[PDB]
Write a protein that binds this DNA or RNA. Structure first.
Lengths: 155, 110, 143, 116, 48, 100, 50
RNA sequence: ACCGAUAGUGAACCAGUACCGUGAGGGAAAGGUGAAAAGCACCCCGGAAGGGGAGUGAAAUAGAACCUGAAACCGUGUGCUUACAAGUAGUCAGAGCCCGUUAAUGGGUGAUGGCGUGCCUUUUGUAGAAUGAACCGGCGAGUUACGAUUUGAUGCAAGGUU
RNA sequence: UAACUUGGGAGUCAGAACAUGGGUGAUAAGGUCCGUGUUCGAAAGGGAAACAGCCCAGACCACCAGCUAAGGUCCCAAAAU
RNA sequence: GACAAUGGUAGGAGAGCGUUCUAAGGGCGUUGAAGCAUGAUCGUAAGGACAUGUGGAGCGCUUAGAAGUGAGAAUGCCGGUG
């Protein structure tokens, strides 16, 4: 702004005594290379929301999927080591869309490892769900046991 | 028709155009005499551009000078040089040195 | 839109010979003005000339009313300082009878480029002899 | 983010320079001078569309008066006679008839002059 | 459904901008009047 | 021969085999209209008077139904910061006379 | 003293109407064959033969 | 959900350097050939500069004053029009002459007639001889953070919320 | 066909001429200060030759349709020599 | 299908056009993108398409979000040219 620009402390010329317009500094808004009037400033954009409204918006996303036949419960995962191709073949047997959200009871490195590279596939945990991932995912795949845990948390 | 261009000459365009009207549309033999016996500062320069256009008509192509006429002749403005002359009581006044682009076109009308 | 418009390929102008013997100046000039303008034709067009030609004979025998032969004067300025002349209507009838009727009718026409062309279709003489017999003029009675 | 002004200013000024084609001198080349004449020409056209209906009615009456006086009658006395008989023909059609069809225009004068 | 989001009816309105033409009604003067203390930049008299 | 027909608040002078432009009518394209009110039947043949010749109708054929060329309506007042811009296109009907 | 109004292109081009250059008086020389100013000496040959 | 060469640090270039002042100090302007220098051997006019051919390349209206190349402004050719005329230069009406489009109630020019004293600011009131602008381009003015109040929306409710 | 109450946001505190009832001045002023109505201000269109305040009358847009107001009908110039 | 409304400065209220960026979805481009030039095209206004030439690598559409979001005047600043 006016004060942050470099130089421009003296007055270019006196007030009267010529046919020039009166000025007070060479770094004013109407001068080339000096001064910004109202520009961006470093600020935040986050805000809060009541707790009850948070839980309701989440239950609305889970119900929206079941209304489209987009929720499938599986047995478990027995991935001994991380193999991406084996995980891709699993998604072909279930006949899932191109984007899939996988839920788990707790962190499982192999299940997340063998799936993070596939495009359009996202993997998270039961307690780490949000409205952005549920809405983005075309289908929802959740474990049998993990499904019951997400139930008691939402109440 | 053959063309010849003289680029970035140091004569003002307004002064070059005064002599270009005396030869536009004349013959290639009567235009050289006009440019010679004239006493303007643009005559020698304009004449050297017309002598190189008649040479291009018989070397690159093959056209006899007997059937050559001045078809088009005009001058354009080139870049200018900004100079300053000191005046009385500490003042300065700008001075312009202008350039011209001379183009000549000779044809046989066939 | 169906209004008719006159052009210079369908206009007919004739020649008239009016007599000013024993007539009022103002009441005779107002009628000749409409003839020169073409206000008596059914194909009148404003942006084109459609009037006819008029010849005035016996101009020196026009008439006035009251004392207008001495009280009515004509002024003119020569554009020089103090250069204003004058002449009475009675003295002008006896010297230039044609300029008396010529200027009286010219003042009843519009001052446009078309009005100056319509004012040249007038001819005024002080006697009864006009040299335009070739044009075959036809007599006209004032209404 | 920064929004620079480009391609939106030149497009609006060129639409004004094309509506001034045919004007004298700088009025068809410069924007500030041509912008003022296009504004004044729009105000002129709005007023001339209403005056247009007065200038043509004034011309029909001038031609009807010339034909009515060829039968030794005035325009005021002919209009009155026609109204009494309830003919109901506007002045735009009476003018078009007096010019081309004379024998037809002569029938309307005797029918109107009969009603006094 | 992120390509078909729809807010509630009557829960969002756009801000008013002054000094951006005469067709808006808040252009040159922007709604301050003519040559007064309340028309100058910096404010006016205090509340009380 | 000719006739004066009243259609849309105006009068016209129509002959047989002529094109005319009137206000928007009710008929659509390709239909047949009929001018009930005839004010005058001119020509050298038997003419008639007024107010309206009982009978002697006119027949035409609808050709087109479009909108006139666009007109721009602009007005302003100096030193008051007040202006207005409008557009307009007048609809019309194009007919063709068949027989008087 | 100073111009009140700027000059337009229409007005500027009418004043420069008579601002032209002259064509010299030249004729063919009897002996040189080139063109020559009347009453002068042929530059090409040097003969006048008055 | 920052800038993109008048922007972003004064400085994208060797910049606190050209330049200014006795001095303490003040302080700029300057990016872009091509994928590859493959940067026009040779002939012709000319003292040179410059230019016309040839050649290189996909392209030289890409030849280092080198991507794209707008307006002001300066020139050449041409269809219509103008030397009896009083003009905020336009608008409405309208012959003649020259053309033929995003195909429709077409395009350009304009003999002649009607009407008509620019724009902005400031004022009880301005064609005003009251103020401002030579012209073209770029830049150039109600914003943000914490509090208060009112209205719309939304969740819950004698409870609501950290 | 309005009026009143509660709440949100304003602008305005330089006015002018004409008619009329008065003070002041000189039964001077396009003077000045109050009462009452209209117009301008913020109002185009027609008339008063030109002429914000006078007379008639309040422009949503288009048309080469008709009847009227003030004011007018010898010519400029539409309408009775 | 009916009657009734729509001159307007200071101001109050309402609905919209265009510009840059972001998130999803769906699409064009060396068989030629953006920009630029020309034209007799469409909408009630701000504005939106199409064809041709130039140009030579990026750019629209749909819904929503966020703003350094719109220039003829300040004896305004800088550059260019009368």
């Amino acid at each position: 702004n006016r004060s942050a620009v470099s130089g421009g402390g003296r007055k270019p010329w006196k007030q009267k005594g010529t046919g020039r317009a009166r000025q007070g500094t060479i770094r004013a808004p109407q001068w080339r290379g000096g001064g910004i009037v109202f520009g961006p400033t470093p600020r935040s954009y986050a805000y809060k929301m009541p707790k009850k409204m948070r839980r309701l918006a989440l239950r609305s996303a889970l119900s929206f999927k079941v209304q489209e036949n987009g929720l499938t419960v599986v047995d478990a995962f027995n991935f001994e080591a991380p193999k991406t191709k084996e995980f891709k073949n699993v998604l072909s047997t279930l006949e899932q869309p191109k984007k899939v959200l996988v839920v788990t009871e707790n962190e499982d490195v192999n299940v997340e490892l063998s799936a993070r590279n596939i495009p359009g596939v996202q993997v998270t945990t039961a307690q780490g769900l949000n409205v952005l991932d549920i809405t983005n995912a075309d289908s929802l795949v959740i474990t049998e046991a993990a499904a019951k845990k997400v139930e008691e948390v939402l109440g | 028709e053959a063309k010849a261009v003289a680029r970035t000459i140091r004569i003002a365009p307004r002064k070059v155009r005064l002599v270009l009207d005396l030869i536009r549309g004349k013959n290639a033999a009567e235009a050289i005499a006009i440019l010679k016996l004239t006493n303007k500062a643009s005559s020698p320069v304009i004449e050297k551009v017309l002598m190189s256009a008649l040479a291009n008509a018989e070397h690159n192509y093959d056209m006899n000078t007997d059937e050559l006429v001045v078809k088009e002749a005009y001058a354009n403005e080139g870049p200018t040089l900004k100079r300053f002359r000191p005046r009385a009581q500490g003042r300065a006044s700008a001075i312009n040195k202008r350039t011209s682009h001379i183009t000549i076109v000779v044809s046989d009308a066939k | 839109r169906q209004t008719f418009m006159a052009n210079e390929s369908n206009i007919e102008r004739k020649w008239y010979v009016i007599d000013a013997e024993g007539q009022t100046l103002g009441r005779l000039s107002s009628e000749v003005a409409s003839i020169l303008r073409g206000k008596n034709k059914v194909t009148y067009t404003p942006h084109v000339d459609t009037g006819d030609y008029v010849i005035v004979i016996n101009a020196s025998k026009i008439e006035f009313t009251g004392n207008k032969e001495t009280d009515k004067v004509y002024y003119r300025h020569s554009n020089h300082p103090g250069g204003i002349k004058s002449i009475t209507a009675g003295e002008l009838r006896r010297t230039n009878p044609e300029r008396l009727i010529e200027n009286s009718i010219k003042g009843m026409l519009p001052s446009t480029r078309l009005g100056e062309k319509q004012g040249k279709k007038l001819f005024v003489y002080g006697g009864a002899e006009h040299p335009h017999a070739a044009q075959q003029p036809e007599n006209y009675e004032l209404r | 983010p920064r929004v620079k002004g480009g391609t939106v200013t030149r497009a609006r000024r060129k639409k004004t320079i094309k509506l001034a084609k045919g004007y004298f001198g700088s009025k068809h080349t410069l924007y500030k001078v041509a912008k003022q004449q296009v504004m004044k020409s729009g105000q002129y056209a709005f007023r001339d569309r209403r005056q247009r209906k007065r200038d043509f009615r004034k011309l029909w009456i001038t031609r009807i008066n010339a034909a009515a006086r060829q039968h030794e009658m005035s325009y005021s006395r002919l209009m009155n006679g026609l109204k009494k008989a309830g003919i109901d023909i506007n002045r735009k059609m009476l003018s078009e008839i007096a010019i081309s069809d004379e024998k037809a225009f002569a029938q309307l004068v005797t029918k109107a002059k009969d009603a006094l | 459904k992120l390509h078909e989001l729809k807010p509630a009816e009557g829960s969002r309105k756009e801000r008013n901008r002054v000094g951006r033409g005469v067709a808006t009604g808040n252009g040159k003067t922007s709604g301050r009047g003519h040559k007064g203390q309340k028309a100058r930049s910096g404010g006016g008299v205090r509340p009380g | 021969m000719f006739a004066i027909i009243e259609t849309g608040g105006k009068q016209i002078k129509v002959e047989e085999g002529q094109e005319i432009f009137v206000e928007k009518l009710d008929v659509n394209e390709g239909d047949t209209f009929t001018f009930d009110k005839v004010l005058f039947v001119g020509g050298d043949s038997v003419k008639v008077g007024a107010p309206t010749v009982e009978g002697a109708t006119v027949t035409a054929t609808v050709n087109k139904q479009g909108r006139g060329k666009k007109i721009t309506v602009f007005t302003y007042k100096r030193r008051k910061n007040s202006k207005r811009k409008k557009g307009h296109r007048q609809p019309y009907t194009k007919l063709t006379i068949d027989k008087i | 003293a100073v111009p009140k109004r700027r000059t337009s292109k229409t007005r500027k081009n009418k004043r420069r109407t008579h601002f032209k250059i002259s064509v010299p008086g030249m004729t063919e020389c009897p002996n040189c064959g080139e063109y020559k100013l009347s009453h002068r000496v042929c530059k090409n040959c040097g003969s006048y033969n008055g």
